[PDB]
């Protein structure tokens, strides 16, 4: 009692269990089948052309034979298809919206536990962070000289967005609470294998277990290009410890963020010179500044930048 699905460039097969898995209430396995089936339509014209019209209309999520018989509809067009060829792309921003939900689900199967009632929880990711990080991605224009961190990476999902999206050197995430570094374990695996069944191409990631406050760490900060920290919960000793960090890191060096570093009226005087805010820019990002729709959510961009520094003391030297 199980349901296949052929990858549409010859890797393993997708094999689904019967009863089908149910993700919550209103989302279940049945419901991915069908819009996976759909997203590799879409991306491959032959498919649809082979396809038989009604299979995607005429469907009973509810029935064995019928959710077998819409399988082995796609399996002969794919079939057909890789007889006619026989005679790694960036994934879409949809496709990759669909990938993510796909890993998360085959992922965190007991998403009770990861006790986030955040509106930064994992099980919400593709509601408004998803969008959030893709307009992140456009703004941020990160080439291969590039070396992106996310301090603090939950399950991973920002990581596997960046690192399927852009062509950055590597793509760290560090996980310091055990539930959501074991479930990146498995997202980590799982993002790999999808992304192999749709003939996908991503960047270079990792996504590991640890400390981003310890000494090992503090290196790897001055070293990254740039940084992404979602610190709306952090104390003021994270925030401190953090902002030292930050302090070694290289000029034009940047830090996305979901609450400012600094303020962004900053204004350098005699008693303001320990701040972090002598050593940065900060701007204020907004999808609502920048056709969205969207929450009216906006994120900060922080850039390394000595000369304001620089420029306050060659004022008291040179007015
Ligand atoms: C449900 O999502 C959100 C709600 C409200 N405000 C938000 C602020 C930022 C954000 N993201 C994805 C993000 C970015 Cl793009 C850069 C740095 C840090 C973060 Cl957390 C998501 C938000």
Redesign the pocket.
Known sequence: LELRLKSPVGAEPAVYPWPLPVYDKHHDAAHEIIETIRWVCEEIPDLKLAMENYVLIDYDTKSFESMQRLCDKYNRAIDSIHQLWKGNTRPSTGLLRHILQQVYNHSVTDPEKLNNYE??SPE??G????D??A??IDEIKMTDDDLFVDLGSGVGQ?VLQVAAATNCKHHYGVEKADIPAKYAETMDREFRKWMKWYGKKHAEYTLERGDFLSEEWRERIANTSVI?????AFGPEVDHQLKERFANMKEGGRI???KPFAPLNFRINSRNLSDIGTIMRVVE?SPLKGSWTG?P????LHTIDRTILENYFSSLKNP
């Open positions: 509106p930064f919400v990711y509601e408004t962070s998803f959030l990080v307009q992140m920002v992404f920290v979602n610190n709306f996305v963020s979901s990002l929450k959510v906006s994120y900060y």
